[PDB]
Amino acid sequence: MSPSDFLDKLMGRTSGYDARIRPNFKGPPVNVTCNIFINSFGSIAETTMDYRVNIFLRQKWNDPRLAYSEYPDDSLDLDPSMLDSIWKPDLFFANEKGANFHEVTTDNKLLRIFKNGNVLYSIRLTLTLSCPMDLKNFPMDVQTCIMQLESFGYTMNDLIFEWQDEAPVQVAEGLTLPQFLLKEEKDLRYCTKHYNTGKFTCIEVRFHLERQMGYYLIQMYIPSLLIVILSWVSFWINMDAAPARVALGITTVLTMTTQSSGSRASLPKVSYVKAIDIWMAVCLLFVFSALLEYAAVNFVSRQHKVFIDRAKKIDTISRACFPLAFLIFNIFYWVIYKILRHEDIH
Amino acid sequence: MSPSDFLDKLMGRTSGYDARIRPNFKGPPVNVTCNIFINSFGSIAETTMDYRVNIFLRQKWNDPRLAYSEYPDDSLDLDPSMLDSIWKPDLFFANEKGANFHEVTTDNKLLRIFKNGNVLYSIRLTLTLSCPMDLKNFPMDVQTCIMQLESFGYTMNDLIFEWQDEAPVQVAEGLTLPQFLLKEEKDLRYCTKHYNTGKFTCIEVRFHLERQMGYYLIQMYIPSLLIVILSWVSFWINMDAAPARVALGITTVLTMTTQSSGSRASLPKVSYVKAIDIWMAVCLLFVFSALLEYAAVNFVSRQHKVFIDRAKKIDTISRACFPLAFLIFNIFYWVIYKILRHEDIH
Amino acid sequence: MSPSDFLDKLMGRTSGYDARIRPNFKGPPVNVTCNIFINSFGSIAETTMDYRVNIFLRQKWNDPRLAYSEYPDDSLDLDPSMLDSIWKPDLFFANEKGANFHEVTTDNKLLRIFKNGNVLYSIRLTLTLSCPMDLKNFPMDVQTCIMQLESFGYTMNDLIFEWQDEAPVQVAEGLTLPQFLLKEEKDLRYCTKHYNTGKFTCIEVRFHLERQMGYYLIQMYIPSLLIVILSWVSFWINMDAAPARVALGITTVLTMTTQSSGSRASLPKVSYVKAIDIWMAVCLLFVFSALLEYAAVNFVSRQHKVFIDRAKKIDTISRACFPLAFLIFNIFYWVIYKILRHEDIH
Amino acid sequence: MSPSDFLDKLMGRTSGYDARIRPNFKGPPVNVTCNIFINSFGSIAETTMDYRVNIFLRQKWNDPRLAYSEYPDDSLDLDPSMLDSIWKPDLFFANEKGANFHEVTTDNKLLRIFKNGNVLYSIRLTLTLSCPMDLKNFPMDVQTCIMQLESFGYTMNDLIFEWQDEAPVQVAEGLTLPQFLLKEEKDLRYCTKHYNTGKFTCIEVRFHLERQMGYYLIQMYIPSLLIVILSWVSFWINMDAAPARVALGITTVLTMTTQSSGSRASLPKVSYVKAIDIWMAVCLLFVFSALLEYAAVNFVSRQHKVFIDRAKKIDTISRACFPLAFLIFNIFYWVIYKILRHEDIH
Amino acid sequence: MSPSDFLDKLMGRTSGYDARIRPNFKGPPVNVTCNIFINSFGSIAETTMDYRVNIFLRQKWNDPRLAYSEYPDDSLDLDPSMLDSIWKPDLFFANEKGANFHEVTTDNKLLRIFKNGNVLYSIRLTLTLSCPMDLKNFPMDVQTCIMQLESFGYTMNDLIFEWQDEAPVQVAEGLTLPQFLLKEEKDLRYCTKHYNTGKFTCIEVRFHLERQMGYYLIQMYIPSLLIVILSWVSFWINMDAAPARVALGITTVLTMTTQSSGSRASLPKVSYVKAIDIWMAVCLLFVFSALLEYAAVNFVSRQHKVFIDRAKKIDTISRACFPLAFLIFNIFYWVIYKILRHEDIH
């Protein structure tokens, strides 16, 4: 029979369907099953404490008033324009900072109704979500980004969100991040919000992200080591080259301070000490100590042969003493940060 | 009885409800009780003199025309789509610079009507509010951010806003700020605006924010101290190392000036002197005075044995004199800024 | 009598009111009186040549078709939703670059009708206005920001805008600007635009803004003076310290050039010479002249006792000659810029 | 007779006017005459290769179905709200990157109909247009900004755009640009676009913009000359001041390289050589050649009286030889760029 | 016959056309042929990993319900306003990050219907598409930008997208890019997406972009070579000029490190080694090795005639040894990157 007649006969004023009334107005709560498909992930900014995602959201629920038997087809697709005339849950995101739909040629929405009365709703969304980040162990850090799906207006007596038993979260093939590696273990947990207005359903997903070290090695760790070796070079210069040694020391100190200031150019102003901060502090301490060493040598050398051998012995000892202690510092630093890094992500 | 019939029987042309007429058209003023829930706080920028907040706003008032007795349920939830057909107050924010609603899957709005005729309206909002800031005592400062809720069109004869006796403001659990600590004492006060058009109701809330010092210590205070000690190092060098001493002095002076210029990179161009400015001025004075000291020593030393001991005595005195006076300056500086910092926030 | 009946009886198809027809279709022009209230002012950017304001706009005119006598109340407030059904003038801003309304909970609009037929319309607006700026005397400058209100579609035969005799412009209490001081004298003048389409009404307001000097003194003027004194220090060094003196001269010259380049970091690329540019040019000239002086001294000293006293006399003269001429330059510079600064703002 | 009746009698379902049908459905093409008024011009960015303009657009065409004779007035203004009910051309801009209307209090639109059936439509628009720029002769360049007006849906059989015989383009009085001078000769030409869908009408206007040199002289050309003179200063220093001369050479070379890198901070990454690039290359060559000269002198001087006079003669020749060749370079550079600059703008 | 009657007689409730039903509701799938015209291309940003394009999109399909025979004209243009009343495919872009229509004076849309029932739909779009980029061989790289057109709601049984046999992609004449060259070979391929909801049609186009080297040569490669030659200059200085040689070495090392840090100012933080990174590493190694060479020479020279000739021989060998090895490095570097660059783009 004519397709157009069936639509309004089922969902029209003649039938009496009301899109403002729940499938069971007084009865067991509506159970909504959800799954998400992630199409792109990125734009993770530490400064603005947020990340941007683009996902497909699928919702499933049963509406007994939409049960159709006469029509032959088991499953019926529909037009996006008729979404306004069916009841839909009022899902919202708690950590939502920015949100928009897509209207490129039509509304990017899908609806499907089955014989039993089950409804499948799929929509395309772009959301910028907020993510609290801990900046300790900043180079060697593992972050967790959450996404919370909640009901704004319906209490647990009316609406109950649940996760799909198989494949709640899948990621698009070939998705990669420049600075992070997305782990394949996704955490599903139950959250419930309590307010002065009542109890509301909530569901959450946690994603584990591991920072990549290559950029930080090429950028920060290696030039600091080069400056330390450059300061070490001064021990092999003649003690009579006072302007040369002083200029080398001053240049190394100023360069170290500038690099230390610039190492936090793209981070939020936190109030604790990071590992990169410890590293720059130790390197600045080494360069300053080398300059103070030459200062002491120059002070000792002008005290007039006993003073000549005493000043020379300091240079000879420091030529084989400064690299060994720095090697010990590197062993103690790099080991314990893989012990703690290996600590369970949870 | 059928749910759909009750809605239009109560709020329809048949009933005669008009959403453009107040609950008591000629009578005592409408009393509206409000409470806010803060879901996220952040984005406090000194340059643009504003901060961004995301809040839930709850309004309560009594409408005698909505009193329902026949229906069994004590409390009735509704659909967000029917908000257009009820009377709502015209609340606006005085310090509102930017505002938007949320439409992620539906309107993020709630409405509830009680048997007596009381209405509860809840809406989700994102607002960028303006906050005048005083930048004196800039590192050790306590700010106050206000939010004013006002009626645009109704005078005190018609509309009166009030605060809830219990729990007007609550904050979401676990909310933290990178650079600030939100105090738990919230100030509620009465504001009334007077214009040439009449008298209007207003309510205000004040939040106290304390800046965190860790970032400023790691960033500004410690490198300046390092430069001061670096300039102090020059007193232990031989007086005959004129190029070395002059280069050290010049490098320290230029570095100090660059750091002083860069200490105000992210602040509005105010016209008064801050504490950080006093600190950089004192450190620049110390480095310049050290350079002038060596200048005087070099001038004295070429005046040809009396001139030799006289020039040496200056170096020996300055080696134990410069750190003591700087220690006294640190004692006087750091104490009085905790005395004044302890001054009552109000 | 019932409130709802009066509204549509007065402004309905039964009455015959047409919102597309002027109050007097063929007759004397409509006279509109306007006043503005300024709620916030700021965001003055020299680069983008514009400033942002947030104002309340009040319009008053007489509509004989809205005269009501029967109803008892002298003055009737209304609902913002009914603005579409009354005639309103088509005011627009000539220097309008950006504009938006406010819809935080309702339309931020007010309407009031009186017994005689007078209408008061109040609306909240945010406008980014364009302001041509003259950058000569850049530190010591007084700017003028204009705002023009014009009719887009109605000629002088139909619409005539006028200013209110008392209190056209008032500013909110406690409004302050970080870098400017808003003067309390506001200029009201008559503007009329002439085009190929006809004659149109226009009204304008001029605001006087005075720049604050504290920021520029702390930032630019004092470090340049410090560099000049640092270059002056070289005159007291021994003439045999050639590397030290040359390094001091080069460092001062390079620092001066860098500061001169950085003094125009946040300004439009104008093609004339500003006062700050004259100041940096004079300081660069002083440092370069000092370096050329030492160059001449070094050239003279190697010409082999007559040459020894001749080279020494230059250093002794320059030690008491360079500060005096710089003091004379400061007297001539600072005086005449207060003479011209005192010139009437108009 | 009543004004309201005439409007719907002329343009209503009773009359039979259809706004989807052209004035002559089958017949000679519709001829549309256009003129533009420029109210503000600016925001010319080389990086984003675009500029922003704000214009008034006037369109004129004849509609025989709108001919009115009975009503007395020769010319009838209308309300902006009735624009939807008349046929309008589908003009679009080819180089349109961004576009928006203005709705400050009403739609900024005008419509006027004459007795013969002629229609005048005026609208206010803000458009960011794309402009391909040639960066050779970058300081001394003349650009051309185009604007193309085209029909999206109508072929030449239906719609034909033309320019007004008198005053197609006029500019608002007092309009000025910070970095450019707008020439008073405007080029009007005929463009026709050919696609696989048919032939479409197009009209274009070309504006000539001349860059101002004052900013570039104060910023780039003069500090480079100062660095060249600073390098020249080294020729008058004693040949025994090896650290001083080497430090001067190195500082000049590094400063020149930094200025050369910074001279292209605000330009697109083009792949050809500009005039500023030639200038910096020549100045870097001069400083490097001076350093190589002192290197050769120092190498020659240690070859042990014949070697003493030979090394001294190089310094004496270079003291009067380096400025003369640089003067010749300035004569050859500055002349030919005014010869080519004088080349006809077309 | 009257034009207005034909439109609603064909597409009206009287006819029974339903825009929610496919041309063949139960039957062979609808075949849609598409072609795109590119009007502007640009805004390729490595950081935000995306590019902006402005295209014309043409869709063709057959609708048997729109077959018209009586009317004389073979082809009928229409009005953009009637697009809502015809069935249109639900095309969407997979890599769509931002999208907007154009409404400058009317909707920039075209529709045309033929006698047989074929429909042509043309629309103007602006889309910011995402493009994964490989940054190895960063200066000498060839990128590929994709665009995927997919159906959101219809499975392969209903909708099938295909490419036009002649001229699927054409580019506007004279289109050029500042940093890239668009290749004239466009790749057309078949993509099919598989999800848990079904099978969906997809089509893709690949564009090949070649980076231009001129900017990188003028900017990075040549100053690094200048610094290397500047470090080479030190071999011709006297071994007794210890402050001069040490200062030259330190300045070259610090400049090299700063340039290496600044070479990645506008790139995403990738974790692999690029060619520019190899180049800067080799140049830093050369400057550091030169400084270590002078350090060894200075250490050897103070070991007290055998030590004099031994230290001199190192300088003489290094004066003809450092350029030859650097030339060999340039030959090996530049050749193999043209071998690999010549590798087929696919």
Ligand SMILES: *[C@@H]1O[C@H](CO)[C@@H](O[C@@H]2O[C@H](CO)[C@@H](O)[C@H](O)[C@H]2NC(C)=O)[C@H](O)[C@H]1NC(C)=O
């Ligand atoms: C939604 O799911 C809940 C939870 O399973 C269902 O509630 C249960 O329903 C069964 C079957 O009638 C009862 O025997 C249980 O006592 C219920 N348990 C609870 C905790 O309520 C509910 O029926 C489901 N709703 C619908 C419409 O199917």
Ligand SMILES: *[C@@H]1O[C@H](CO)[C@@H](O[C@@H]2O[C@H](CO)[C@@H](O)[C@H](O)[C@H]2NC(C)=O)[C@H](O)[C@H]1NC(C)=O
């Ligand atoms: C809104 O609150 C005001 C303030 O309490 C109420 O005004 C008072 O009402 C009581 C009870 O009728 C009177 O006895 C007082 O004289 C009123 N005081 C003032 C200052 O007006 C008002 O009645 C309340 N409105 C409603 C609708 O309940």
Ligand SMILES: *[C@@H]1O[C@H](CO)[C@@H](O[C@@H]2O[C@H](CO)[C@@H](O)[C@H](O)[C@H]2NC(C)=O)[C@H](O)[C@H]1NC(C)=O
């Ligand atoms: C608007 O104001 C104008 C200017 O005052 C009025 O025009 C005058 O009206 C008076 C009173 O009728 C006449 O005597 C004058 O000759 C008019 N002068 C001019 C220059 O037109 C006008 O009447 C006012 N309009 C209304 C509706 O009150």
Ligand SMILES: *[C@@H]1O[C@H](CO)[C@@H](O[C@@H]2O[C@H](CO)[C@@H](O)[C@H](O)[C@H]2NC(C)=O)[C@H](O)[C@H]1NC(C)=O
């Ligand atoms: C639009 O302008 C065109 C160009 O002038 C007109 O076409 C001409 O019309 C005249 C007068 O009827 C004819 O004699 C010419 O042969 C036409 N020339 C061409 C090239 O078509 C056209 O008539 C105008 N349209 C209207 C509606 O006035």
Ligand SMILES: *[C@@H]1O[C@H](CO)[C@@H](O[C@@H]2O[C@H](CO)[C@@H](O)[C@H](O)[C@H]2NC(C)=O)[C@H](O)[C@H]1NC(C)=O
């Ligand atoms: C759309 O194109 C498909 C692919 O060519 C058509 O399917 C074929 O139709 C022919 C003609 O009837 C059949 O003989 C083939 O067996 C079909 N092949 C397949 C793989 O389906 C289809 O008919 C076209 N649809 C329309 C409406 O023309």
Ligand SMILES: [Zn+2]
């Ligand atoms: Zn986990």
Ligand SMILES: [Zn+2]
């Ligand atoms: Zn308090």
Ligand SMILES: [Zn+2]
């Ligand atoms: Zn004035």
Ligand SMILES: [Zn+2]
């Ligand atoms: Zn021309």
Ligand SMILES: [Zn+2]
């Ligand atoms: Zn290919």
